[PDB]
Amino acid sequence: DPNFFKMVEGFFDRGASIVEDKLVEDLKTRETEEQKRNRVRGILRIIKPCNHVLSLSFPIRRDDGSWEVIEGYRAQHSQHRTPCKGGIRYSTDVSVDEVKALASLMTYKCAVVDVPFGGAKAGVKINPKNYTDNELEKITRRFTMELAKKGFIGPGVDVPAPDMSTGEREMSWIADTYASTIGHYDINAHACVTGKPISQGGIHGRISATGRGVFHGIENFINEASYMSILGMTPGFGDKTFAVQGFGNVGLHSMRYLHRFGAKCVAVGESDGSIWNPDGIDPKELEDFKLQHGTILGFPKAKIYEGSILEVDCDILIPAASEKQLTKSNAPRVKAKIIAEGANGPTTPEADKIFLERNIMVIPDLYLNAGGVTVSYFEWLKNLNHVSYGRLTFKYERDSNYHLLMSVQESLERKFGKHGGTIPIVPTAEFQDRISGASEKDIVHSGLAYTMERSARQIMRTAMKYNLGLDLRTAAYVNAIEKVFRVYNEAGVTFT
Amino acid sequence: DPNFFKMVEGFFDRGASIVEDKLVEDLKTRETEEQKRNRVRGILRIIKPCNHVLSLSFPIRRDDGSWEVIEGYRAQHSQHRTPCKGGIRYSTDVSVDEVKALASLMTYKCAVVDVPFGGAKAGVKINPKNYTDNELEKITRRFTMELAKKGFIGPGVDVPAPDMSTGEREMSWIADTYASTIGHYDINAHACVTGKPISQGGIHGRISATGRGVFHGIENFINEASYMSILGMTPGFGDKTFAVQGFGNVGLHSMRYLHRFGAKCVAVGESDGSIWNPDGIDPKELEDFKLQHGTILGFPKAKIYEGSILEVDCDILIPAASEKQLTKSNAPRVKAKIIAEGANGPTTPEADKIFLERNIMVIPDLYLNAGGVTVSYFEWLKNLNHVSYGRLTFKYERDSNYHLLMSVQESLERKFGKHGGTIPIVPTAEFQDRISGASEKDIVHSGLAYTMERSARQIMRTAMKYNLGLDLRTAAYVNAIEKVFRVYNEAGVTFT
Amino acid sequence: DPNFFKMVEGFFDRGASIVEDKLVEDLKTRETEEQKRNRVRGILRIIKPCNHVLSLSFPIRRDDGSWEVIEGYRAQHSQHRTPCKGGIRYSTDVSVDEVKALASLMTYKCAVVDVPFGGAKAGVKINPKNYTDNELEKITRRFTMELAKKGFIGPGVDVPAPDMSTGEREMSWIADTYASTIGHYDINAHACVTGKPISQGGIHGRISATGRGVFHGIENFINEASYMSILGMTPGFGDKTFAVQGFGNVGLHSMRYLHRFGAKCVAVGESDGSIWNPDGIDPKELEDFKLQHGTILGFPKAKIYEGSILEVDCDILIPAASEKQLTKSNAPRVKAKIIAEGANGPTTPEADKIFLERNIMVIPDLYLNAGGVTVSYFEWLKNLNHVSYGRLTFKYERDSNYHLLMSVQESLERKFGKHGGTIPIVPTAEFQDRISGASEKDIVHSGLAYTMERSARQIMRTAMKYNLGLDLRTAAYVNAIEKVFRVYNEAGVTFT
Ligand SMILES: Nc1ncnc2c1ncn2[C@@H]1O[C@H](COP(=O)(O)OP(=O)(O)O)[C@@H](O)[C@H]1O
Ligand SMILES: Nc1ncnc2c1ncn2[C@@H]1O[C@H](COP(=O)(O)OP(=O)(O)O)[C@@H](O)[C@H]1O
Numbered sequence A, B, C: 001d002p003n004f005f006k007m008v009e010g011f012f013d014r015g016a017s018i019v020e021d022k023l024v025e026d027l028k029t030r031e032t033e034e035q036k037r038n039r040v041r042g043i044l045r046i047i048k049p050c051n052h053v054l055s056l057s058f059p060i061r062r063d064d065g066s067w068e069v070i071e072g073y074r075a076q077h078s079q080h081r082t083p084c085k086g087g088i089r090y091s092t093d094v095s096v097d098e099v100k101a102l103a104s105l106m107t108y109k110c111a112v113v114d115v116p117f118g119g120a121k122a123g124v125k126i127n128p129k130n131y132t133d134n135e136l137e138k139i140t141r142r143f144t145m146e147l148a149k150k151g152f153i154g155p156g157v158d159v160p161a162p163d164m165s166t167g168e169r170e171m172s173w174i175a176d177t178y179a180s181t182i183g184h185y186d187i188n189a190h191a192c193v194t195g196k197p198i199s200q201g202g203i204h205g206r207i208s209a210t211g212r213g214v215f216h217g218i219e220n221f222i223n224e225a226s227y228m229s230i231l232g233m234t235p236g237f238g239d240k241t242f243a244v245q246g247f248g249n250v251g252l253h254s255m256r257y258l259h260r261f262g263a264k265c266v267a268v269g270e271s272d273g274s275i276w277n278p279d280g281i282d283p284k285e286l287e288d289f290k291l292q293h294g295t296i297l298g299f300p301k302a303k304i305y306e307g308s309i310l311e312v313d314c315d316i317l318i319p320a321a322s323e324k325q326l327t328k329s330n331a332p333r334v335k336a337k338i339i340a341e342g343a344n345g346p347t348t349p350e351a352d353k354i355f356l357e358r359n360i361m362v363i364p365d366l367y368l369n370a371g372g373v374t375v376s377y378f379e380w381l382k383n384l385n386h387v388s389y390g391r392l393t394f395k396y397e398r399d400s401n402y403h404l405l406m407s408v409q410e411s412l413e414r415k416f417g418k419h420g421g422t423i424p425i426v427p428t429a430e431f432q433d434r435i436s437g438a439s440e441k442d443i444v445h446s447g448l449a450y451t452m453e454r455s456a457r458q459i460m461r462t463a464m465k466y467n468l469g470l471d472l473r474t475a476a477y478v479n480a481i482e483k484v485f486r487v488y489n490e491a492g493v494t495f496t
């Protein structure tokens, strides 16, 4: 047990060193005044620390008429990409050292999924309970104010997002505050923050995002025989079998989207206890079974099983909960062959270590739960576009598609004295329903999917030119460093 | 063999006169207060000269600690279209009278290819050699500064680009300077200049842009039997044969893309000497053969041939070098049937004259090397879109496409007791590779081709209208004069 | 006995408590919904902590081509007054916790001398030695940049100033950077920072400013028999006698301006050793004597005396050096009857305590070395005025003055058969030289003393209001709190 701030910092130094020798080179193969390049490693010392961090105290006024001051931080890591992105945390456990780590995390996380934002993160030292809905709103709005005035929020400067401590509403308040104040004259005022309600300029399909990110990330590697050969898989065992720890939003969708492609939830474990059925626990019901109650416990069919499931027999173990739940102790011990980080840093740097050796593939948090970020990028664009995705093209292609099927029809019925004998026109049962109910959402998923795939392959190749086999994490961090580097490099030295 | 400034100015006056009589009419057929429209030629008097030209002297400081002042000009021709476009030249031979001519040239060149920019051009009276890389950067950045402060650079005002004297690099410096200074608050700060590296917001497929522009321009006329009849071509002579003078970026790609479609580089000539093989010099090697050296000379297989190529026996002669290399004297002497201007004004108004008569087709610089401009327009849009072309859509259609092929399959397999007998699903061998490796560049290329063809068509009619035959140039100028006139007409009449 | 951050914090809490009971009243005597005002002490909880503090890391690049990142902080305490004021410190000993304290200090220091600025302070974790003049400049400029972009410098937002670690030139760099960058369009761009050279918009008489502040502060109390009665003075002892510890800029001018009005420097002590003569050490020579050398040591006339001076027999002891050098130990122990804080917090809260009791008057740092701040306010105004003080009026009243003397003359010469017998016209010997060499400086000097004079009796009356007797410090702290309170109250408590 270290703390993030550290792991991330360690994760960087490492990827930084791995890249360096081969960032004098593969690149300026050559150009070499001096052959100190070895040297534009000053670049990497610039990249490392957060460039800006604003701490502030601001007063709100509670409903009981009493004044109270509030502490809050927002740290902008890099600005190599022009608008900073990152969530806002409402917890009494927010430290300046952490918003800084998490800002540091997203700087690279965005790079991984080709999202053109610099990493940022905010924290308000508050516990959203001790405050009413009216009180929460005042905090957000007054917070939005101070950020704007010091350039830590703005559609071209810094675009926040919600954490798990905050909701779409608070984002709505943030947007509405900015648009009615400093950003009155901004035609893109509502692009100042993402994760906001649809009625307020939100994007469709923001909720499945993180979960699907986990899915496609797993799948990209699950269909690569190389990595599946080292574990000896492209699976043979009940076809597939997985356990999910943490039945939050991310874990839920993860189980669902994975189950439906022929994979088997053997066990689901939560904050409380856990459950098991080796037949397949089934999303859905479990799902219903809970909204239904309050927990997963006492589930029919499925079993009080217990402690954590981090080591239930399976292939794919999915941490979708808090931190650190794969330490070192329960490390040589998991089973799961593929550990899919559906949460930020749920494995200590040593779990990685024992895992790496035990010949099991840990799919990095840096890459896997970047699904939400990827879609948040799309929401930001949507606001800049001032139009829902697909609105002007949905009907155009529906026509075009029917026009092809009509063409295949005619062409076949000439070959051939006819009319309406041969009937290609009909789309498949699904193709109809998808043509039928095409919405922005479908584009957003399709975008996410392509991004995950394209990013999955860039990690696989970065891992290979570096001879890295199963340590996807530092390979992922490396892919990030190289990307953040050339932005700095091919920009200049003289001015800023 | 005068100043280039002239030809352009002569080229205009001419197209202006041709349009005029029929710009009292074809338009206000009628409307006629007075019947002086004949008079809203004041419009054409306004269109003609550059509206603004800024000369400036600014100090840099060399690496040897010595101060040195630097002269620089940028001329904005028209602002009928809201952001000015045009390159920056680093040569000691830049005159104020030239940046004006070239600005004048692009003002019409953009109109030809429906690119919504006003013509501009900058020149820094400097020789990039006598200066280090550090020194070059200082010059750019300080130059970018002064332009910004006087409104001669900005994403909505004036968007520069590189010339052959400048690289992507310097464009990167320009962008980074602007974004860190005057345009800090601009959400489109990096749209202030094009031709910049991909890591800095450049567009994929820029390098081939100007070269392909040359290709498609040639091809559009090469597949029209009318124009190919007058020369007696839709070619018969070794199928096809062409000589390229100037092995720069434009000439290189030109030879490659032309060769590829069954056409034959008989000869390649450069700054130094020249080269011949009547079998086909082959891009490629010549290409490699040089990167390789420093020059084309001493090329195996191909021969020390010598002086300029401008009259080597071929059909298509492609000037892709400096100015004026088709004067007058070597005019009734070329052989080439088709002179494809892959550079700005390489033929004097007189070469045109003898050529026109000798019944050979000169494809205008005004239209042909507008390929780079067309794509620069796309780069500008890309920055406004804040997303790479095809991103969110590449996978969406890949799905959609497979969905249709699936539909054609099913539909045919009912006609018919089956399953997977009939197999439409498979795309053609190419359609796969296209779907497979779809990238931004494919979108860029498709856009470039579309523009070049449609402009060729636009030109061909304006030619056949006034029965200009093979006078493609003053047709395209007439085309451009008309377009620039319209915007002026249906707008400013009493003020601004 | 404390450090830095703490004394100030303690100094506030205290004055805050003293004011409170009488800040439900003297004020809203009355108005009392509820009678919880006792409550708009939330105001005082808001006033207390700094509202904003920006930490940043930024790269410079040394002359040896190596990259190096640099840490820097600037804290804005209050913004009840619209442009923040405060110095910039170049020391490796800068903590985030001091820049906050010192920002906190000035927020009240300005209030004391009716200077309408909110307290701020910056620190760059650097040692100006290990860096060349070229290197120092890059640090300043790049630092100025990041402050501007986050709204921590600007003529209407935050106006910095030099500390002892920084000079007028770095201020000049700061101004020139801002004016050439973010604040290019600002007609008051050079009002962004004070303490800059005269050629760069500095004000005349900035150097004597802090020193004279010390003088007039001492003098205001030295001519009040009440306070001079409790010590039993309006002095009788060698008329007067004073020791100065710290021969910096402030201590130097202090000794000079004090000496000049019939007061004796008995002893001068420094960083190194010390010096005594009970006859009078004489500014001037000591002054000359060291420019001369490097130190005060080995001074003729005057003696190696030694250790600190802090207790040499005198009336007035003037700490014009580092912190803390009146602790507690050497507290019941001084003799000086008047301790004039010519530096920030040179007495621990306990020295105050023993002093208060021992019936000796400590003139607060909060009030005394506010002379520099007062004049810095004038420099800010000067830039806003875009004209040197007195320029259009100097000659006008020179004429007016001579016109009165002419009037007195004539009028007397009627009373009386004459012409030019009676001669009032002549000004006094001084009045001539004053009229003769009137400059901006004379206005600046004037404006300062009136401030020090009025602020003096503002504190006297407040000390009187709360029966604080000789607790001049928390008389001044209370005095500031009241001011900052009224601003906060008589405006912003709803959503501001
Ligand atoms: N966060 C980031 N940091 C550094 N580079 C990035 C980041 N996001 C994207 N890039 C880079 O920007 C370049 C330009 O990409 P572009 O073609 O505009 O879209 P895409 O990134 O989808 O290909 C790419 O080479 C990509 O690696
Ligand atoms: N650079 C230009 N200068 C003058 N007129 C132009 C220019 N570009 C386009 N136009 C004219 O303006 C009209 C509006 O263009 P539009 O059809 O909306 O876009 P596009 O030019 O991309 O087809 C076009 O028909 C064209 O004739």
Ligand SMILES: Nc1ncnc2c1ncn2[C@@H]1O[C@H](COP(=O)(O)OP(=O)(O)O)[C@@H](O)[C@H]1O
Residues within 6 Å of the ligand: C080, C081, C107, C110, C111, C114, C115, C116, C117, C118, C483, C484, C485, C487
């Ligand atoms: N930094 C400050 N904080 C709070 N109040 C202040 C500050 N500076 C000045 N004031 C108050 O603002 C008021 C404005 O008075 P004004 O007419 O400007 O007279 P003066 O020129 O003496 O300030 C004064 O009563 C003064 O007490």
